[model samples]
Target: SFKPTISVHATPQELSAAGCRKIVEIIEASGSQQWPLSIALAGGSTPKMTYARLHDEHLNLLREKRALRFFMGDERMVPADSTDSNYNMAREVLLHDIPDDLVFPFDTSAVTPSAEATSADAMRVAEAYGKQLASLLPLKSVGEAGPKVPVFDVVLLGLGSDGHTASIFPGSQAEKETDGKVVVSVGFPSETMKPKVWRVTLSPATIMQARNVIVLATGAEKKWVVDGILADTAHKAPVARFLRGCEGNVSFLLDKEIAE
Candidate 1:
């Protein structure tokens, strides 16, 4: 079990800038090292603000780095140009400002419901990303006493009002997800959405294997959910389950809205 730490900021803007700067420092420190700084990004309004701020203020930092990779923590099964598309939002906010060759998306344009059903789709794409990550970073050997998982440089996540992270909503199919080599598409069994709404989420087991985990939260509305996640209760949120699973450092990057 891992104990997660929290870093509070006065405003979302300040936190966003600070987070980007921290990432720059990290990548700079890892220069000419084993692999590029692999990062997993989450999508949402608050995260979008962070991406926008990062792009606006730290474009130069990223431009200087030749080795860097980005992947989405979760994405909606929508068209590449759809309003709810995580890839779309990330592109519009961050990727659009960076070199096309640098960014690797999940290929939202693929015509597939889930990789389980499609010959080669988003799930397979994500598996390729994982393989790409394994090549860059050395994961612990399977025979080790510790869990066998990819040691990501950083895995960024966002929380919904219901304390859902990466589409693992309360009592949703994602809650029971223990394994899936690649990304898994999840839907709320109780809700109905068109286009077969599904969330491309990294498995909890995969996320727990990371060396570092970062959960970002913003806005006053998230206070209760934040408290719920941090508190000890049988009723677990997706983020809470994740926080409990990580073996290394886990941090919460929060704005003033959550601080209050």
Candidate 2:
């Protein structure tokens, strides 16, 4: 098992700067002047800030680089136009900053436009998204380790207050599953979970195959959760599982307050 490389930044300003630099450095290190830089983004307040910072800090470099591709680590089962959608959040900042053809956000429109949407619809969406990933970013090239999994240059994830990361809720089937699938449909979260809807997320094993896995878990609200992940003491741990299984670079870029 591997322990995560944790780095604490004095503020979001410092951390996002450090985070975006890591993204750029990894993008440069991988791809070998052939494949476009591929990064799987997370959805959360801190992750959003990092995207904005990443754009403001490195737009010119990324624009002039070989090429770039954006993928989501997870997405809510809703229209891309929905405010809660991860695609929309990135679009408002980073996605809107890049070429439209380079982006690869999920299409959740197949799900109905109401709360009555079923998990089956999300399953269909997940299948299509997985196929796209496996076809475009197979691990056969410059990936960490592989059984033909998606080889993300960078996979950015967000840590939830309850020790969840990338929509893999604590104790959920997605958290424990060791399957080789690229993505999975997680349905019917607990009532307290926000949005309370089905979601499509990259599988735990899939994330473990990333060449560089970066998690921006900030805020003092999750101080204890961060500690628990560091210790791997939680009963149902998502971040810990990925960190332990990951054979590539794993880092937790944290804000000082959370580390304190």
Candidate 3:
């Protein structure tokens, strides 16, 4: 039987620090292979702290080699400068310190100004981003039929208290996606509000193919969902589906409070 490893730390800071170290190790190891490493970043407070820690402690590791390429697991359909934008958040912290050309973000400019035009614009952007990823990463034939899927070196994901991960909200179409690499639309979990706003996200099919996946969950607010995931029981939550579907190594990094 396969199971994801659970790592608990004393505090959110400690958890984030550990996660940063793991990320650095993966990057260094992958870079040593003399190939550019593709890393997908998550968005949320937990991941934000991890990015800040990486900026402060591991800046040299990222700067020493131009072999690491950054990508986002998801992004809000807003101006890149907006606080709600994951690209903006990462840029404010870690990506700003890295080479400009090494980071690939969703083209928010492709999104139209009108709400009615959003879905169409998002679809175009998602297709464009999917093509960009296909061009950059090594694609491998998967399954008996031999469809290709891009293999990323690492993907960082945040666990929402509502049990969503990487914007694949409960009951959303992103959860059922099996063919495409990326998708765009609304209908995120109700707790996220702003349900009318569009979101660009890597589909579950895309995320599950990564070589390594690190899921960050912290605080008392996340305890219940964390427990459910750790219990390995049936659940309709997106996180559960993702964990169950992932074919690569997956690890859950949590604070002691949430783990308990």
Q: Give the candidate number with the greatest TM-score.
A: 3
| Deviation of model 3 at 65, angstroms | 1.4
In the predicted model 1, the residue pairs found to clash are: none
Q: Tell me the alpha-carbon RMSD of every candidate.
A: 4.1, 2.9, 2.5
Q: After superposition, how far is residue 55 of candidate 1 from its true place, in Å?
A: 2.3
Show model 2 residue runs off by greater than 4 Å. 31-35, 140-147, 232-240
Quote model 1's TM-score. 0.78
Model 3 is weakest, by summed lDDT over 10 consecutive residues, at 180-189
Candidate 2 local lDDT, 1-260, one digit each (tens):
55778899987778888888788777666655754778898887777887897688778655656356889988898888888899899999888878776788988767657665567877788788888987788654324343556778788988777667787776677776555644554645554468777888887877877878998877887787777666645564434445567757899899887888
Instruction: Quote each prediction's TM-score.
Output: 0.78, 0.88, 0.89
> How accurate locally, in lDDT, is each candidate?
0.65, 0.75, 0.75
Candidate 2 achieves a global lDDT of: 0.75
Residues 1-260, candidate 1, lDDT per residue (tens digit)? 33577888987677776666666666677775634567778877667777787778777766655445677766676666877778889889888877665676666566443442232354554556566555655565323554445656777787766666776666755566545333344444124322345556666666766667777888888787778766676464434455676665677888878766
lDDT for model 3, please: 0.75
